[PDB]
Design a protein around this ligand. Sequence first.
Ligand SMILES: CCC1=C(C)/C(=C/C2=NC(=C\c3[nH]c(/C=C4\NC(=O)[C@H](C)[C@H]4CC)c(C)c3CCC(=O)O)/C(CCC(=O)O)=C2C)NC1=O
Ligand SMILES: CCC1=C(C)/C(=C/C2=NC(=C\c3[nH]c(/C=C4\NC(=O)[C@H](C)[C@H]4CC)c(C)c3CCC(=O)O)/C(CCC(=O)O)=C2C)NC1=O
Ligand SMILES: CCC1=C(C)/C(=C/C2=NC(=C\c3[nH]c(/C=C4\NC(=O)[C@H](C)[C@H]4CC)c(C)c3CCC(=O)O)/C(CCC(=O)O)=C2C)NC1=O
Ligand SMILES: CCC1=C(C)/C(=C/C2=NC(=C\c3[nH]c(/C=C4\NC(=O)[C@H](C)[C@H]4CC)c(C)c3CCC(=O)O)/C(CCC(=O)O)=C2C)NC1=O
Ligand SMILES: CCC1=C(C)/C(=C/C2=NC(=C\c3[nH]c(/C=C4\NC(=O)[C@H](C)[C@H]4CC)c(C)c3CCC(=O)O)/C(CCC(=O)O)=C2C)NC1=O
Ligand SMILES: CCC1=C(C)/C(=C/C2=NC(=C\c3[nH]c(/C=C4\NC(=O)[C@H](C)[C@H]4CC)c(C)c3CCC(=O)O)/C(CCC(=O)O)=C2C)NC1=O
Ligand SMILES: CCC1=C(C)/C(=C/C2=NC(=C\c3[nH]c(/C=C4\NC(=O)[C@H](C)[C@H]4CC)c(C)c3CCC(=O)O)/C(CCC(=O)O)=C2C)NC1=O
Ligand SMILES: CCC1=C(C)/C(=C/C2=NC(=C\c3[nH]c(/C=C4\NC(=O)[C@H](C)[C@H]4CC)c(C)c3CCC(=O)O)/C(CCC(=O)O)=C2C)NC1=O
Ligand SMILES: CCC1=C(C)/C(=C/C2=NC(=C\c3[nH]c(/C=C4\NC(=O)[C@H](C)[C@H]4CC)c(C)c3CCC(=O)O)/C(CCC(=O)O)=C2C)NC1=O
Ligand SMILES: CCC1=C(C)/C(=C/C2=NC(=C\c3[nH]c(/C=C4\NC(=O)[C@H](C)[C@H]4CC)c(C)c3CCC(=O)O)/C(CCC(=O)O)=C2C)NC1=O
Lengths: 160, 160, 160, 160, 181, 161, 161, 161, 161, 59
Amino acid sequence: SVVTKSIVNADAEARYLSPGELDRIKNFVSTGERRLRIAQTLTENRERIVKQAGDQLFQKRPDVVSPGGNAYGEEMTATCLRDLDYYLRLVTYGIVAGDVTPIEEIGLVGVREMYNSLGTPIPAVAEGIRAMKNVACSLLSAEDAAEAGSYFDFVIGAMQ
Amino acid sequence: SVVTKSIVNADAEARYLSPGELDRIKNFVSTGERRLRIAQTLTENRERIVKQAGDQLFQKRPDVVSPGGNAYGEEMTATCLRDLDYYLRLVTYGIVAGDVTPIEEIGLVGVREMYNSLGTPIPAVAEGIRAMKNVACSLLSAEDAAEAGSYFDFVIGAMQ
Amino acid sequence: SVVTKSIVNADAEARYLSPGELDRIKNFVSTGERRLRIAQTLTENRERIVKQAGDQLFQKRPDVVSPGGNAYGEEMTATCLRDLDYYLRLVTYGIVAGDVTPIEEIGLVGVREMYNSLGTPIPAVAEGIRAMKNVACSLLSAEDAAEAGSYFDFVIGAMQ
Amino acid sequence: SVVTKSIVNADAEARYLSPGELDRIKNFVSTGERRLRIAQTLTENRERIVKQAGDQLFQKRPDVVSPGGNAYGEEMTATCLRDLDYYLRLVTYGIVAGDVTPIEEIGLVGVREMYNSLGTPIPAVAEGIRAMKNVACSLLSAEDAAEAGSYFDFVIGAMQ
Amino acid sequence: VGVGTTRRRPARIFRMTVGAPSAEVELVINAIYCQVMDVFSGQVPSQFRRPDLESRLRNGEITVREFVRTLASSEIYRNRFYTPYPNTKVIEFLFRHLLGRAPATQAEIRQYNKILADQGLKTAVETMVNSPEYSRYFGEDVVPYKRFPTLPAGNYIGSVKADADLVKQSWSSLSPSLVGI
Amino acid sequence: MQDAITAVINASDVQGKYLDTAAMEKLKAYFATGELRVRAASVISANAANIVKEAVAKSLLYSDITRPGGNMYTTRRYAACIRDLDYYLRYATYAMLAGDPSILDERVLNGLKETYNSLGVPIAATVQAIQAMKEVTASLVGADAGKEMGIYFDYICSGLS
Amino acid sequence: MQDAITAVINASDVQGKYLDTAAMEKLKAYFATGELRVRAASVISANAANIVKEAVAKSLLYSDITRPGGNMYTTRRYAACIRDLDYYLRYATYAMLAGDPSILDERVLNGLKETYNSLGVPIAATVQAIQAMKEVTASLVGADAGKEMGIYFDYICSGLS
Amino acid sequence: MQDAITAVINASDVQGKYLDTAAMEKLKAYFATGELRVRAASVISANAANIVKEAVAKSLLYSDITRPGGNMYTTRRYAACIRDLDYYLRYATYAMLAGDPSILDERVLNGLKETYNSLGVPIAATVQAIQAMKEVTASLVGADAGKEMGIYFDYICSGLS
Amino acid sequence: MQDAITAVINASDVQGKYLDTAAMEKLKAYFATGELRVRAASVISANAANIVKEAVAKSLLYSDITRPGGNMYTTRRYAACIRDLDYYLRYATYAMLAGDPSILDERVLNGLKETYNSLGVPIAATVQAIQAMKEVTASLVGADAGKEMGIYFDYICSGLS
Amino acid sequence: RMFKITACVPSQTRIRTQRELQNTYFTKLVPYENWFREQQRIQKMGGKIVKVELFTGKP
Ligand SMILES: CCC1=C(C)/C(=C/C2=NC(=C\c3[nH]c(/C=C4\NC(=O)[C@H](C)[C@H]4CC)c(C)c3CCC(=O)O)/C(CCC(=O)O)=C2C)NC1=O
Ligand SMILES: CCC1=C(C)/C(=C/C2=NC(=C\c3[nH]c(/C=C4\NC(=O)[C@H](C)[C@H]4CC)c(C)c3CCC(=O)O)/C(CCC(=O)O)=C2C)NC1=O
Ligand SMILES: CCC1=C(C)/C(=C/C2=NC(=C\c3[nH]c(/C=C4\NC(=O)[C@H](C)[C@H]4CC)c(C)c3CCC(=O)O)/C(CCC(=O)O)=C2C)NC1=O
Ligand SMILES: CCC1=C(C)/C(=C/C2=NC(=C\c3[nH]c(/C=C4\NC(=O)[C@H](C)[C@H]4CC)c(C)c3CCC(=O)O)/C(CCC(=O)O)=C2C)NC1=O
Ligand SMILES: CCC1=C(C)/C(=C/C2=NC(=C\c3[nH]c(/C=C4\NC(=O)[C@H](C)[C@H]4CC)c(C)c3CCC(=O)O)/C(CCC(=O)O)=C2C)NC1=O
Ligand SMILES: CCC1=C(C)/C(=C/C2=NC(=C\c3[nH]c(/C=C4\NC(=O)[C@H](C)[C@H]4CC)c(C)c3CCC(=O)O)/C(CCC(=O)O)=C2C)NC1=O
Ligand SMILES: CCC1=C(C)/C(=C/C2=NC(=C\c3[nH]c(/C=C4\NC(=O)[C@H](C)[C@H]4CC)c(C)c3CCC(=O)O)/C(CCC(=O)O)=C2C)NC1=O
Ligand SMILES: CCC1=C(C)/C(=C/C2=NC(=C\c3[nH]c(/C=C4\NC(=O)[C@H](C)[C@H]4CC)c(C)c3CCC(=O)O)/C(CCC(=O)O)=C2C)NC1=O
Ligand SMILES: CCC1=C(C)/C(=C/C2=NC(=C\c3[nH]c(/C=C4\NC(=O)[C@H](C)[C@H]4CC)c(C)c3CCC(=O)O)/C(CCC(=O)O)=C2C)NC1=O
Ligand SMILES: CCC1=C(C)/C(=C/C2=NC(=C\c3[nH]c(/C=C4\NC(=O)[C@H](C)[C@H]4CC)c(C)c3CCC(=O)O)/C(CCC(=O)O)=C2C)NC1=O
């Protein structure tokens, strides 16, 4: 959580939580309801969101799904969709958290090494997350899209 | 070089090279003529090897030469050939040295960073290196191919 | 010992040692090396096991060393550590023997009677031996610690 | 002891104790007899000197004696006097030892932190110690008093 | 029964590095004291701290590496670690405090043990400060931080166990009685 | 470390399922508690030093522990005792805001009992002092805040003993 | 330090005797099979990445281990898992070149079981992954060299279990 | 470390009362013994190398330990044996000159038996060498000094036993 | 650092061109002289201590530098004077065997002049000692070996400049 | 007695993501005895020694 990140900084500083840090925690408390509503919308439209994102990503880079590609074949394409779904669930967790702390520990630490080992293309994965961001903006309110887009954007940058 | 690596160990020790280290230097001196002969063959047939290896790499990984691939178009493909030629010449320099250290200093340190930033697939570049090794095996004697294959394989591992 | 207990049971039923009993006798004799090694470790560290565990006992049960308690004063506390020393010695004997009949024969038949006559708290003695067991876990490897732990378990169980 | 401090320095040097350090130890052995006579005088005036110095200190800092001060009430004033007495006993022990390090370990190391928790005023405590030094100058012979004043001054400097 | 992400995730710690002069420079100074010397709270650098070393570091004349060497050489470190604890444990204390890791092998202990026995403690701390590992793992001009080394044999479990071992015993005068109200 | 929200997220990740209604209301409970938590944290920081002073006065001051040979009968020993109490209080305040005991387990209660034992400092004396600090803290923070602070401080005291 | 030739030398040193005929024969065998071992080791290093990829595909992937809550569910755990297999292979190939199983016990198997137990890694899963690596490495190295590599790989597995 | 005068001070501090006249008389006895101890300590440092050589000849020389495979039969092992004896002598000299054995217990003793057990060095052989060193040191220092230094050496041997 | 082959490779890399026949001839000269250089370097290693002693005597035998106030007139100063020459000799031997002097210049010559200037030690006196070392080394190793040693010593003289 | 020495070492082996310019070019003060090991260590790293100066008054 944002509180968790502030606590880590405070523990390093060896000082009680700063007044401004507590103020941001108060803001997180205020925005808990709005963040939960946005996360509920994403979870509700989960299947359609990542389905459209998968079509967009395969259209953008057809060699991911073509013969000789990493996800060539139905089973591997489904596995690629699962990896995207893992990322989508992490983004929903992060939107609830209000901080990048949830995602960073899951899918943003060593992810490049794991993807290189399996053989999947890191740039194509990043584009898939971008396609998800566009779909989410379509399926969410304007300011809801801004916040959700921010969390999505950190995920995309991590892939880079 | 073998002498260079021995010099590094001697620099830390501040002590004269042991009899085994001197024996390693003597072995390099004994095989200097063999290294020069292998380099003569490689340099003489270098251009032909480059063109043959390009054909093999394009067959094995047609995505690179496909539309949307890094080497799409004559100019990009020529750049791919030039990059492969730089790698092959570096391999020749390393073979003459007798150690992979000269090749590692010239390149393959940060090569992942550079090639990934450029946008060409690291696995496809590695496949091209493998094709070059196969062509060298065809064009060289087995004993020379053993040493040349070893230095090639070091380049392949660094690319990985 | 395992040998004497097997002989006793066979004596009661008037049977020469069964083939399986003979196998058990053979096995215990062969693994006697490991048994002696464990006992050697414990006798090597008699000083710290007793000292550290006894201090842990005093901290866990302050009432025993409090004024108007059984262990008040350095003289009485010295005797208390002496008792813990005796029980560790019995445990090493039991490990060597491979059976708990030496431990029982020497120092668990009537402990309640003796300690109640002295005024010492029997549960407190059990907790001190528990402290010795916990100290033993660090000193002995996991596989070794399980073997010695069982003898400690019998001592504490009889004590309670 | 001064010998203990010298031994610590020698241990850090990983050398046997220096001949000059041993000579210093012999010199303090000579000084110890006169120091013991001075210490006997200090023990003789253990209570009277404390009372006189305490009256001077109370005059210096009337607010502490006044209600709402640190030593507010008879019990708090007695505790303040007892703390001063403990410091005086530490001063006597340090003077006998010859090394201010024993005094520093017993007190004045973290004493400021203790005072911050307790609410005691460091300035008034320091003034009381200085008044004790003046009273001691009258109480003891000047040759012995000069060294004793330095020990008291070391405590005063640590307080300040 | 599924293990959550907190399965030895958080052992790492914030890294302190020197920079342009600001009040944060004293935060870096606090970190150097907090790690090279074992001030448990991390909010209490007690009296013993070396203000002249702090002044050099603030000016920029002394690099963080040199700051560490002076702090380790000083009698402050000796009194809290060298003299009370046996030299055998002192080697481990040096590895934990300076490099940030438990001693990897008996061979490392052996090298530092003869240094301690003959050359001296100041020589030993100087050798570790000058050691190649400090230059990269701990870094140069970077306040050393606790590090759990995966590659060395058994060093993760050893580092975890040694770091779990909080400092026991003390510099002792007027040793405490066993019982208190 | 962990938070209430972070711990629910961890549990959901273990399950492998997107936010459930049960997840929503557990998180919402943390969201509702946030106001109480932050107000109490500000109060705790403001009166932190006074809290330590009150606790030791109520429990260990003017006792044999303070009197010679009581493990607190030195200027250095007394300062160390106050320091360790402040360490526990600060980490407990952190943990109260976080809502989870992971912070206390990871930092506050790691090897502390063994170190205290080897030193000879009384675990029971520390536990009594911690309970006294809990009483003072509950009074200062308020009734609702005192209940939560009690839970976190209880984890520290129980782990120590 | 221990190697095959060095261990023969060390045993002779303990005796103090000059080189025996039996010692000469054992050292000669090491000299004799060094050629096959060296060529295979180079091949292993060249195809090291492919081997660990094949091993996780054959054993550790597409299962509950990599599904949620399986100690590989997160990218950090996955990266550490492939890294651990890579280290296992690297020190194993070191030891295979050396010819002596003592080296791996010195580095790879020193406290490894205790560390894995503490962190919660499945010992059995690691053993099966090592066996899967053994199959892949045998395929790449060839039977004659792979049999030699298999013995030292199996020693690593025996240490784990 | 601790000294004789410091030990008297420590007892007085534990009591809480000022140093008694009889306790001061005990301190005066320590002061009187210190002069002879200091002169003898200077003599001991001068002939320390010769004392170590004499003890090594008494036990280690022409011994199975020195013979191959005897655990003293290495260049590193022989150097380590010499260094360990020298370190024990230095600590013993510090303890005898100080007049308090607390320093010896504090630094040399703690886990010395455990370290020797882990290394595999023979504790009994070291103890016999310590007795030989005590005899040589007593001869060089003198009878009165030999009693104090011999008592400290006997204390170290007793801890080893 | 650099070697003969490495320096040729560096020039070829700057050029970007394939291996040249003239570069091959230069490398062949390095290979041809390498065997004799290796044997001579072994001789230099065997008699390194004697060479240092002879050169030290030649430059400084009852020297005014040894006499008080001569900047080498201390036990520490004399030991430092010996140490610097020994280090220069070892690095020069490695450079002569390698056939390239760039490594010697970078490792030894870089900063040496500034340090010597700060110390005030006479660079010319050190150069005379270095020339004496070159003469003694040439005598012991042989004329052909002396030519290579002379080149390394000339680089050392340039570093003194 | 100590010496003020400034040297710049290129971090060729590790292309460090974290800010390393301060390590790349630095000015420090080392004790006279420390200067021997430090100069050798900087030479081993391969960094060029920009300057050697003596803070102590007497050579
Ligand atoms: C060997 C003993 C020693 C000395 C002498 C010394 C001097 C010294 N004084 C300093 C700072 C300073 N010195 C002053 C001093 C003054 N300001 C005024 O208005 C007055 C006229 C004057 C005092 C009489 C100030 C204000 C600073 C801080 C400058 C800053 O960083 O903001 C600094 C900068 C680093 C720092 O400490 O923050 C050094 C190195 N350092 C030492 O280790
Ligand atoms: C062996 C070293 C050592 C020392 C010295 C020591 C002092 C000490 N002084 C105390 C109290 C105190 N100390 C003072 C001190 C003063 N008030 C004044 O106005 C004066 C300026 C000044 C003394 C001259 C006061 C007022 C208290 C009582 C605080 C209170 O409870 O209100 C207490 C707390 C009560 C207790 O004993 O339980 C301790 C522990 N403890 C130690 O272990
Ligand atoms: C994981 C976090 C953490 C803990 C828990 C910790 C505890 C800790 N407490 C210690 C000592 C100590 N702790 C106390 C504390 C007390 N005195 C009392 O009367 C009370 C019963 C009690 C607490 C109120 C004392 C007196 C010492 C020894 C101080 C000394 O004599 O040197 C020491 C030994 C080093 C030292 O002297 O400070 C440690 C490491 N350190 C840590 O990093
Ligand atoms: C919590 C972090 C985390 C993630 C995300 C994760 C995903 C993950 N993706 C996998 C496979 C895969 N991932 C891809 C990925 C792609 N192929 C493409 O064409 C696309 C560009 C791209 C995705 C959009 C493919 C093709 C595979 C199957 C590889 C194969 O079997 O050939 C595998 C291995 C097979 C398995 O599931 O056992 C894992 C573990 N694991 C994790 O621990
Ligand atoms: C060179 C000899 C050597 C070895 C082998 C070694 C092992 C080793 N593995 C570790 C962790 C680990 N080991 C694994 C291993 C696995 N998890 C799985 O699901 C699989 C079944 C399996 C491998 C395929 C994981 C996941 C971690 C990290 C756990 C964590 O922090 O969450 C650690 C802890 C430090 C770290 O996280 O890196 C060590 C020290 N260390 C060594 O020095
Ligand atoms: C495996 C490696 C190893 C070596 C080499 C070794 C040497 C060694 N040489 C010894 C003695 C000795 N060494 C020498 C040596 C020499 N005197 C001379 O005049 C010559 C110049 C020179 C030999 C060529 C002498 C004379 C002694 C006997 C000294 C004595 O006891 O008085 C001793 C002590 C007596 C004993 O063996 O118990 C050892 C241990 N120990 C080892 O563990
Ligand atoms: C505080 C002072 C201090 C002491 C006492 C000390 C003891 C000590 N002795 C050691 C080793 C050793 N000690 C011996 C000693 C002996 N071998 C024999 O046959 C004899 C019976 C005996 C000598 C009387 C040996 C052989 C080793 C090396 C063990 C090995 O690697 O084989 C080691 C291991 C590290 C090393 O190689 O030095 C320590 C730490 N360390 C210290 O800092
Ligand atoms: C101020 C401190 C200081 C000292 C002490 C010192 C000693 C010193 N002793 C020397 C030589 C020497 N030293 C000795 C010593 C001895 N030979 C024996 O048989 C005896 C046992 C013993 C004397 C009691 C000899 C024989 C030489 C001449 C060796 C030679 O150069 O051929 C030399 C080399 C010649 C020279 O002076 O240039 C120096 C420098 N230098 C210093 O700066
Ligand atoms: C890479 C190899 C290397 C070199 C070359 C080097 C130079 C070097 N020479 C030094 C000292 C020195 N060098 C000398 C040398 C001499 N005095 C004389 O009279 C002669 C003419 C001459 C020898 C031929 C002396 C006397 C000192 C000590 C300076 C002093 O404190 O007086 C020092 C000072 C630190 C020390 O004591 O070592 C360095 C760093 N450092 C190195 O790491
Ligand atoms: C605070 C941020 C920051 C900056 C700016 C910085 C600069 C910086 N650039 C470096 C290297 C370098 N920088 C370049 C840069 C270039 N070569 C070209 O042809 C281009 C014109 C140009 C890039 C636009 C090169 C080639 C090196 C390596 C030099 C070497 O060691 O060989 C180095 C040497 C250490 C290293 O390898 O990183 C530093 C310190 N360091 C920092 O911490």
